[PDB]
Amino acid sequence: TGRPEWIWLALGTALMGLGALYFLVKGMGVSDPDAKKFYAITTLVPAIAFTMYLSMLLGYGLTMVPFGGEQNPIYWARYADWLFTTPLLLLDLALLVDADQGTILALVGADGIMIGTGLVGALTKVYSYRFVWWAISTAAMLYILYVLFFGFTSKAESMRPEVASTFKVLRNVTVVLWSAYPVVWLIGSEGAGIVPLNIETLLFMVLDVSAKVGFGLILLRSRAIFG
Ligand SMILES: *C/C=C(C)/C=C/C=C(C)/C=C/C1=C(C)CCCC1(C)C
């Protein structure tokens, strides 16, 4: 096939794999129970991303959805990735500030809605309705971000500055990166079709890698993960 976006898919696969292995190696050397916890969660994130990037690289996770008078290429494998990686990242943040079970449940649920409606919208055949689903998915993301900024930050204040400071950074990277996804979707292949798929794939790999390996590197190198 040789689609123009394959190089970005290859680069995404490469970076997710390397990040996974490094986390795995670093994770199985640590003896601390809590640290192990964070390591297992944070290693799984890029591990899942790797498998999906690899699949997409190999020609799977791609479907032609008709709308706008065109046969649009929609990479659905992405949602198969995010469905499990986004809530896991959320869990990492939750465990960090000792969030309550109710909060976590609500965050993971909002996250499920976000990815769920997101895919439904990415698959919808009525052009205008694609944006209705997109709209609901974004509303869910804003809820998650609101909670992370207003809820979590507040509880991270019962933690040690080292932990509060680590969370702030992770929270910040998350707010900035996550905020970008809906915009990429809106102007890319799933939306307005303004930004071409190859470029679109590039933007997604940068955000994905930053949000997983970037996030992991920051979290795992901190002393805040220790019991
Ligand atoms: C490793 C992957 C990460 C951190 C992915 C984050 C993804 C989002 C915040 C995605 C958000 C979306 C919307 C707000 C609406 C349209 C569809 C999505 C799923 C692209």
Swiss-Prot record:
Protein's GO biological process: phototransduction; proton transmembrane transport
Transmembrane regions listed in the UniProt entry: 6-25, 40-58, 76-92, 104-123, 131-150, 169-187, 200-219
Cellular-component GO terms for this entry: plasma membrane
UniProt superkingdom: Archaea
Main location: membrane
Signal sequence, renumbered to the chain: none
Keywords in alphabetical order: Cell membrane, Chromophore, Hydrogen ion transport, Ion transport, Membrane, Photoreceptor protein, Pyrrolidone carboxylic acid, Receptor, Retinal protein, Sensory transduction, Transmembrane, Transmembrane helix, Transport
Spans within the Extracellular topological domain: 59-75, 124-130, 188-199
InterPro entries the record matches: Arc/bac/fun_rhodopsins (IPR001425), Rhodopsin_retinal_BS (IPR018229)
Gene3D superfamilies: Rhodopsin 7-helix transmembrane proteins (1.20.1070.10)
Subunit record text: Homotrimer.
Sequence similarity: Belongs to the archaeal/bacterial/fungal opsin family.
Protein name in UniProt: Bacteriorhodopsin
Species in which this protein is naturally found: Halobacterium salinarum (strain ATCC 700922 / JCM 11081 / NRC-1)
